């Protein structure tokens, strides 16, 4: 099964033009992006799903800016990227569910908002 470089929390302010949520699989084995499935959860609702077999992204209305960098996936980078407009309204624990064909794994990362 998939293992992770776990980071407990990442925080953003107004200065961050874009906010990234890390996700790093340390034991991925896929030789092709068609074998990887990526899903992000916020409160029990799927926020971003990337079906590598279909090369299709799926995001709701209030997460339109959310996407990941597919070019970095084969190295284990499943980090979520979104515009800060979508980040401020939705702050909390994020689950990064990575699927490699039959193998699976998930990690919990809290996105925190700071103010100066």
């Amino acid at each position: 099964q998939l293992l992770f470089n776990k980071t407990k929390s990442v925080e953003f302010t107004f200065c961050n033009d874009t906010v990234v949520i890390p996700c790093f699989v340390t034991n991925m084995e896929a030789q092709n992006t068609t074998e990887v499935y990526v899903k992000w959860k916020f409160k029990g609702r799927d926020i971003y799903t990337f079906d590598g077999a279909l090369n299709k992204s799926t995001v709701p209305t209030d997460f339109s800016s959310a996407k990941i960098e597919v070019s970095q996936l084969l190295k284990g980078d499943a980090s979520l990227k979104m515009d800060k407009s979508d980040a401020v309204s939705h702050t909390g624990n994020y689950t990064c569910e990575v699927t490699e064909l039959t193998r699976e794994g998930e990690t919990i990362i809290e996105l925190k908002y700071r103010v100066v």
Partner: antibody
Amino acid sequence: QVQLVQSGAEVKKPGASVKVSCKASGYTFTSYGISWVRQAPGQGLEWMGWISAYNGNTNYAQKLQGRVTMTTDTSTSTAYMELRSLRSDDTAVYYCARGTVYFDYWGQGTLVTVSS
Amino acid sequence: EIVLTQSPATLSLSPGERATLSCRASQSLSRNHLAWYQQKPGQPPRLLIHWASTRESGVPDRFSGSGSGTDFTLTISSLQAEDVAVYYCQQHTQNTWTFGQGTKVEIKR
């Protein structure tokens, strides 16, 4: 060349125990999970449990009531299923499978007949 | 504990016709967590489609899967005499694994 060769069929009396082995080859054994599914003659598939080939961590079907113990042997890339206190309900064909989310490779099955 | 209800229980279609097999889920499922299996009499189950739409290598394109949430479907476009089997849908969601009761596809003559 991914194969799962299962042990031969066994006949047991009610109350006895049975152990079924699942020898793996053609892939890195500890990189995947192992699941067990049984099927009574003429009925549907019944999921039994899942085991990590790397850890040994297990998830058992609740209805089995702790009558099942699953183990792995990373020295021989072999998985084991032991069911104790057998009853006539347990007469079924027992399968071992590789995946975790789904199951992409299956053993040939082991018939375990439980009768007096 | 997800329950997968599979309809219909039995299906009799003439060769060359199109079969529609349903798999209802008692709770919503993500698409990567639904898979389809084919089992011929006396043989171990054969995996057809994973992630609810992606067939395995060697699986003919006549088998296509679709659906989201609580409704998933396996479609056999041009039924062949070699497709007589029982078809099972399987889910895995948050440390739970269940199988559907299956659909037995029969050839009509």
